[PDB]
Amino acid sequence: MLKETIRSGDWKGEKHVPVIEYEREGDLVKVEVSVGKEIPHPNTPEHHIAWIELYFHPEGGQFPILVGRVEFTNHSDPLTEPRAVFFFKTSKKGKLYALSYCNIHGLWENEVQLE
Amino acid sequence: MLKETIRSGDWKGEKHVPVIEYEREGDLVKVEVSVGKEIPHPNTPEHHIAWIELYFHPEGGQFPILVGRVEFTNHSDPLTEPRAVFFFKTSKKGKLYALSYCNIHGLWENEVQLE
Amino acid sequence: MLKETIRSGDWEKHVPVIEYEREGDLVKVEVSVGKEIPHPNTPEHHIAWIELYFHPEGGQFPILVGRVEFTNHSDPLTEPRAVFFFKTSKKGKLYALSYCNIHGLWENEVQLE
Amino acid sequence: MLKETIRSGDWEKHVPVIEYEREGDLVKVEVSVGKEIPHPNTPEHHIAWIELYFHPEGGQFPILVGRVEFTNHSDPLTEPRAVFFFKTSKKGKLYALSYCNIHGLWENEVQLE
Ligand SMILES: [Fe+3]
Ligand SMILES: [Fe+3]
Ligand SMILES: [Fe+3]
Ligand SMILES: [Fe+3]
């Protein structure tokens, strides 16, 4: 299947696994998703991190819900960093998932508990 | 794992699994993807099929490649149909994958051999 | 602003062509760029996407019907051409907005009879 | 065509705000719609996306830096606000194009010093 192709652990050299960091003041959550924020992943017209989708899967919940989708659309100058910040309100607890795409290295995922 | 939330089997009384139909003439490939072409899926502002992505995983290939992404953005009038046609050139043989999203029923997938 | 950057012509065909067929309320729309004279399709230069809007008569604003992204430009080569399907009994104007990674925004329109 | 449909008045806040921070070539850009005066945010009425363009002073075309979709409008409630990051040593103009599902396209601009 296609889900089989979704990786969640890097291989040395390149960095793909999305990093999910959040901040929460009551109901409003602040989420930062990124790829190669320290050890940058290549970013050129031929090889780059095209986009990152953010899902939220509430506890006692059947389906993950797509919160947002960000596209890094230029890879020369300007050079768009595969890094973004999303804003959403919710009163539920659950886990956040990040799905990222490298144009030549497929899909990648990660997660974090929204406490 | 978000990967494990992806479904490939419908539950009685709602189509979600995307159907993939292709027509190849030489190096030219025409792909039609859709959800509930015969037995429609609900299409309202509260419930609908938001988008479908088409990946091509060539044989002797390590990663699936995203060919295209189409978004059905309105759900009143006009009512955007979760059905679309893509066009691409390739000389490789391989497997085609469709990833679709229902805003309340999550991610779904299917595949077809690109002979 | 941004609207002023939106072109209608050529430079290399960039103008998105809109073609539709109607069967009652169902409109089948094909949008494309350089279907005769192909536009460059390479990682460095290509058509990235097209948005299809419908501005119904007796309606103040245009409504986004669908958006398509042509995401690979090597092999496979995603041709900047797509077909949408949407139901509507109304009549009006169809707008198509396409984007070239190095030549900006291009628009076009056709009457939906 | 589409050009004429793009507003920048005030519908109820629709006009997308652009704010940025600069550290060398690295530009932190935050785009939003109605952070002061919240725009409706329901399945029927909401801001769906915002596109951020950069038009270099010595460039003839505006380049799409990034795009963001706010995909859920119940709970969670994706707020139409995002932060982008891009590198560029050049200066010029920044454009934001936001879309409301029932009020169309809106635009704004800010000089990138
Ligand atoms: Fe990579
Ligand atoms: Fe559903
Ligand atoms: Fe071009
Ligand atoms: Fe509005």
What is the residue type of D67? R
- Spacing, Cα A101 to ligand 1 middle (Å): 8
Picking from B1, D52, D77, B51, the residue whose alpha carbon sits closest to that of residue C64 is: B51
HSE-CB at A89 with a 13 A cutoff on CA atoms is 11
Q: How many A from CA of A35 to the centre of ligand 1? A: 10
Among the partner residues C30, C81, C88, nearest to B78 by beta-carbon distance = C88
Instruction: Report chain C residues whose CB lies below 8 A from the CB of D97.
Output: 2
- Sign of the dihedral through C-alpha A90, A93, A94, A100: positive
Q: Which two tokens stand for residue A114?
A: 């929204």
Query: Residue B107 C-alpha to ligand 1 middle, in angstroms?
Result: 24
Could you tell me whether strands D92-100 and D104-112 are parallel, antiparallel, or unpaired per DSSP bridges?
Answer: antiparallel
Experimental method: X-ray
Distance CA A1, CA D87 (A): 37
Phi, psi of B16, rounded to the nearest 5 degrees: -135, -35
CA B24 to chain centre: 18
Instruction: Give the separation between CA D48 and CA B73, rounded to whole angstroms.
Output: 9
Q: What are phi and psi for residue C4, nearest 5 degrees? A: -65, -20
Q: How far is CA D89 from CA A34, A74, B48, D25, D92, in A?
A: 22, 15, 43, 5, 10
Within 8 A of B97 by CB-CB distance, chain A residues are: 1-2
Instruction: Say which DSSP state B75 is in.
Output: B
Asked if D65 lies within 8 A of A73 by C-beta distance, the reply is yes
Cβ atoms within 10 Å, residue D100: 23
Domains, chain A: 1-115 (2.60.40.730)
Question: Distances in Å between the alpha carbon of C4 and those of D3, D61, D107?
Answer: 8, 11, 12
Burial group, residue A12, by CB count within 10 angstroms (0-12, 13-18, 19+)? exposed
What token pair was written down for B59? 């044989």
What are the backbone dihedrals phi and psi of residue D69, each rounded to the nearest 5 degrees, phi first?
-110, 135
Pairwise CB contact (< 8 Å): D55 & C5: yes
Dihedral, CA of residue A40, residue A42, residue A44 and residue A45, to nearest 10:
-130
Q: Record the resolution, in angstroms.
A: 2.5
Spatial separation of the C-alpha atoms in residues A62 and C31, rounded to whole Å: 37
Dihedral sign of CA atoms D38, D43, D45, D51 in order: positive
Would strands C92-100 and C104-112 be described as parallel, antiparallel, or unpaired? Answer: antiparallel
Which residue in B37, B105, B109, B111 is the catalytic one?
B105
| Rounded Cα distance, A59 and A65, in Å | 12
Q: Could you give the CA distance from residue B15 to residue B9 in angstroms, rounded to a whole number?
A: 9
Binary contact (B70, C65; C-beta < 8 A): no
Three-state secondary structure call for residue A10: coil
CA distance B7 to A37: 32
Give the torsion through C-alpha atoms of D41, D43, D47, D52, to 10 deg. 130
* Cα gap D34→A87, rounded to integer Å: 13
